Write an enzyme that holds these catalytic residues in place. Structure first.
Site, short mmCIF file in Angstrom:
data_model
loop_
_atom_site.label_atom_id
_atom_site.label_comp_id
_atom_site.label_asym_id
_atom_site.label_seq_id
_atom_site.Cartn_x
_atom_site.Cartn_y
_atom_site.Cartn_z
N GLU B 46 0.85 -1.18 0.00
CA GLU B 46 0.00 0.00 0.00
C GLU B 46 0.88 1.22 0.00
O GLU B 46 1.76 1.36 0.86
CB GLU B 46 -0.88 0.05 1.24
CG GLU B 46 -1.74 1.33 1.31
CD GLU B 46 -2.52 1.42 2.59
OE1 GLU B 46 -1.88 1.49 3.68
OE2 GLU B 46 -3.78 1.46 2.52
N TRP B 47 0.67 2.11 -0.96
CA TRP B 47 1.37 3.36 -0.94
C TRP B 47 0.45 4.37 -0.22
O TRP B 47 -0.61 4.68 -0.73
CB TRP B 47 1.80 3.81 -2.34
CG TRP B 47 2.43 5.18 -2.33
CD1 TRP B 47 3.19 5.72 -1.34
CD2 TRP B 47 2.40 6.15 -3.38
NE1 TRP B 47 3.59 6.99 -1.68
CE2 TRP B 47 3.12 7.27 -2.93
CE3 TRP B 47 1.82 6.19 -4.65
CZ2 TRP B 47 3.28 8.42 -3.71
CZ3 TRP B 47 1.98 7.33 -5.42
CH2 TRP B 47 2.70 8.42 -4.94
N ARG B 48 0.86 4.83 0.98
CA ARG B 48 0.10 5.85 1.75
C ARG B 48 0.44 7.20 1.16
O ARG B 48 1.36 7.93 1.58
CB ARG B 48 0.37 5.77 3.26
CG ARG B 48 -0.41 4.65 3.95
CD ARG B 48 -1.92 4.95 4.05
NE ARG B 48 -2.12 6.17 4.84
CZ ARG B 48 -2.16 6.23 6.16
NH1 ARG B 48 -2.03 5.13 6.90
NH2 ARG B 48 -2.31 7.42 6.75
N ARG B 82 -5.15 8.50 2.48
CA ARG B 82 -6.00 8.52 3.66
C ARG B 82 -6.25 10.00 4.00
O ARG B 82 -5.32 10.73 4.35
CB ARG B 82 -5.35 7.79 4.82
CG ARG B 82 -6.21 7.70 6.10
CD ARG B 82 -7.51 6.91 5.92
NE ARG B 82 -7.27 5.53 5.54
CZ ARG B 82 -7.64 4.96 4.39
NH1 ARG B 82 -8.35 5.62 3.49
NH2 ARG B 82 -7.33 3.68 4.18
N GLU B 86 -10.36 11.16 7.99
CA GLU B 86 -10.35 9.75 8.36
C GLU B 86 -9.05 9.38 9.09
O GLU B 86 -8.66 8.22 9.10
CB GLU B 86 -10.46 8.90 7.08
CG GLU B 86 -11.77 9.08 6.29
CD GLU B 86 -12.84 8.00 6.50
OE1 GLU B 86 -12.54 6.86 6.93
OE2 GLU B 86 -14.00 8.28 6.15
N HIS B 143 -12.61 4.49 8.67
CA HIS B 143 -11.76 4.45 9.82
C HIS B 143 -12.31 5.31 10.94
O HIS B 143 -12.81 6.43 10.69
CB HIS B 143 -10.38 5.03 9.50
CG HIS B 143 -9.47 4.09 8.79
ND1 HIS B 143 -9.64 3.75 7.47
CD2 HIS B 143 -8.35 3.46 9.21
CE1 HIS B 143 -8.68 2.91 7.12
NE2 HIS B 143 -7.88 2.73 8.15
N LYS B 170 -13.58 -2.49 3.58
CA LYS B 170 -12.58 -2.46 4.63
C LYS B 170 -13.00 -1.51 5.74
O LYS B 170 -13.42 -0.40 5.46
CB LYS B 170 -11.25 -1.96 4.08
CG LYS B 170 -10.25 -1.64 5.15
CD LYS B 170 -9.09 -0.84 4.65
CE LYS B 170 -8.11 -0.64 5.80
NZ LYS B 170 -6.95 0.20 5.42
N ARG B 213 -6.23 -8.68 13.84
CA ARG B 213 -5.22 -8.64 12.78
C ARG B 213 -4.61 -10.02 12.59
O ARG B 213 -3.90 -10.26 11.60
CB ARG B 213 -4.09 -7.66 13.11
CG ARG B 213 -4.50 -6.23 13.40
CD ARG B 213 -3.29 -5.29 13.41
NE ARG B 213 -3.64 -3.88 13.64
CZ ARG B 213 -3.99 -3.02 12.68
NH1 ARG B 213 -4.11 -3.43 11.43
NH2 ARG B 213 -4.27 -1.75 12.98
N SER B 232 1.74 2.01 10.08
CA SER B 232 0.85 2.95 9.45
C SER B 232 -0.46 3.07 10.25
O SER B 232 -1.37 3.78 9.84
CB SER B 232 0.56 2.56 8.00
OG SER B 232 0.14 1.21 7.89
#
Lengths: 251, 252
Positions: B46-48, B82, B86, B143, B170, B213, B232
């Site tokens: 995942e690229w944040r 993100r 959130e 989130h 998600k 998790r 993250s």
């Protein structure tokens, strides 16, 4: 509150690992005990119902003595699991009480398991006897078929405290994934609202294995692992159990 | 449920997939982190994007995405901005956020985009359709870093995500109490068993919720986030340890 047995403080820090020794004869008991010294466990449970000569006092005593001599560090838990609650054989109530009283009187065991459904009079008396000889009591209940409602699980656990159990213990079988969660919810409600001592809980089978791993957060003070053979469905190897508990304890 | 395949990875089958987040401010940070992650044991990167300093300069975002794709060539890439609302690292208007995600889709460099459930229904549906037309899967997310909604609200959010075209709903929530962790798991089981027709990702954040998790294989979460060196989100554990636990639970 916590329970201390041979310098092991139950109800503090990471959940304690218990492994069940299942030997049929004195020879098997000795070889199993020797082999168990390699495993990283905290408490050794002797599953007496797996022993073939349970009604011969002198034989039971000789085996307990053998275990005590080989495993000199760890607390020793004496458990005759009745056929009625998943065990290997049955005894009369009287036989079961005399067996446990003999274990208490020998000085060879640090704790005894007494099944909640044995009878209040009998449980009370034996708990009293155990405490008079400095022996801690795990009071237990097992359901190998289903998971009762959380309210009924908590009811059993509080009745156990009421009867004087040092450590209430309940093991239930899930039929669905939600059943695992019901066992965990009962565990949290008990530990947070009603318990003034440590409790041990598990949801059995592969499906409930998570209940054997996350006691540090949810409230179960001990968990069972398998050395070579499982003493209940869902137990993973002691090395794997230790690895997971360690990760969760340091995460 | 139907599984979701991103490249050669089948999400929703077997042990949960491990996702790790790449967080870099400048292109130099991005390149350095991508190089360090090459060694790591994860399944999806995942690229944040919200951590990236120049998200409103298309060429900079594109170059950074290209740099990651040149260094990490065999793992699917998830582009995730993100938003501040959130719990993210910067704020964008709705229009900038939608344009950003469309740029990601148009780059041909990312396999997945993360779209936030509460961005606005019209915008989300149009963007989901656009991603799909260009062969980009959508993880739709929500989130809450302070609390855990009622299980029924959690399930409604996952279901709305499905309704809006999400390939993978998600949700990440924060436990105030131990019981809150169980509420997140209950919602997961209810969603997966009664309503889900596709994989879902769920987590109760912080150390207290870490079991969420780890136990995805039994409870129904198809993927889980671990940390390479820096997390993250609260409660992520190292990828090495995450892999160890997942393998143990798979072989229990």
């Amino acid at each position: 509150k916590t329970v201390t047995v041979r310098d092991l403080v139950v109800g503090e820090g990471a959940p304690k690992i218990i492994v069940s020794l299942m030997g049929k004869t004195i020879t098997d008991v000795k070889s199993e005990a020797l082999a168990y010294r390699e495993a990283d466990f905290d408490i050794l449970e002797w599953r007496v119902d797996h022993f073939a000569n349970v009604t011969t006092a002198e034989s039971v005593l000789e085996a307990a003595g053998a275990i005590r001599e080989i495993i000199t560090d760890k607390p020793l838990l004496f458990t005759f699991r009745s056929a009625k609650e998943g065990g290997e054989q049955a005894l009369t109530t009287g036989q079961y009480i005399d067996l446990n009283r003999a274990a208490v009187d020998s000085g060879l065991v640090d704790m005894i398991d007494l099944e909640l459904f044995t009878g209040d009079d009998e449980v009370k008396a034996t708990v009293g006897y155990a405490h008079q000889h400095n022996v801690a009591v795990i009071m237990s209940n097992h359901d190998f078929h289903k998971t009762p409602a959380a309210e009924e699980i908590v009811q059993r656990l509080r009745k156990m405290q009421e009867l004087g159990a040092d450590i209430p213990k309940i093991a239930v079988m899930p039929q669905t994934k939600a059943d695992v969660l019901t066992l965990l919810t009962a565990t949290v409600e008990m530990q947070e609202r009603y318990a003034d001592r440590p409790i041990i809980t598990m949801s059995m089978s592969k499906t409930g294995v998570i209940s054997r791993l996350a006691g540090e957060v949810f409230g179960s003070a001990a968990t069972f692992g398998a050395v070579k053979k499982a003493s209940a469905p869902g137990q993973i190897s002691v090395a794997d159990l230790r690895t997971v508990l360690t990760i969760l304890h340091q995460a």
